[PDB]
């Protein structure tokens, strides 16, 4: 629940420009996007895992959206029509937009990317591996073990055990 004591970011902070591209336009050029935004995505997702609070990593989300917007401006300035043809092929070629259905326009788009920015396409499993980075922010401390100074105590094994006085003391037995 959200109460008055919990702080929230204001409406002026969350009113920035967001990526409004469709799914086929995001899937086209998706492999070239992460080679340019590897640092922002990994930092944002690492601090989103451990911090687990949407108020934290807001500036990391701003950096992720700014990197994606800068990459899409760089795609838009040079050979926008090849990206349009690749996104149209990926939209219209299959239900699930698989890259294996049409690869000729993918080759033309990768040729234009290599001719313009000298960027190569990564392999098919570059982003699905475990990614290790060095983070600028410090790691959050591991929780200390809970302390219980008044626990339920038992008889310790080093306690002395003399024989019982008067035996069982229960109905004449000793």
């Amino acid at each position: 629940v959200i109460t008055n004591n919990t702080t929230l970011p204001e409406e002026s902070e969350l009113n920035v420009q967001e990526l409004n591209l469709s799914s086929a336009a995001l899937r086209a050029g998706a492999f070239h996007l992460g080679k340019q935004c590897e640092q922002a995505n990994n930092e944002f997702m690492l601090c989103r895992q451990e911090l687990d609070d949407p108020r934290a990593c807001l500036a990391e989300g701003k950096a992720v959206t700014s990197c994606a917007l800068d990459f899409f401006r760089k795609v838009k300035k040079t050979c926008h029509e090849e990206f349009t043809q690749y996104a149209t092929c990926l939209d219209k070629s299959s239900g699930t937009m698989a890259f294996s259905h049409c690869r000729k326009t993918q080759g033309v788009f990768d040729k234009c990317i290599k001719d313009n920015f000298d960027w190569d396409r990564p392999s098919y499993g570059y982003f699905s591996r475990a990614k290790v980075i060095q983070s600028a922010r410090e790691a959050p401390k591991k929780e200390e073990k809970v302390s219980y100074p008044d626990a339920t105590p038992g008889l310790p094994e080093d306690y002395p055990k003399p024989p019982a006085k008067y035996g069982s003391r229960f109905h004449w037995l000793e």
Partner: peptide, 8 residues
């Protein structure tokens, strides 16, 4: 497409 994205 990329025509949605504003020029800046």
């Amino acid at each position: 497409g990329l025509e949605q994205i504003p020029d800046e």
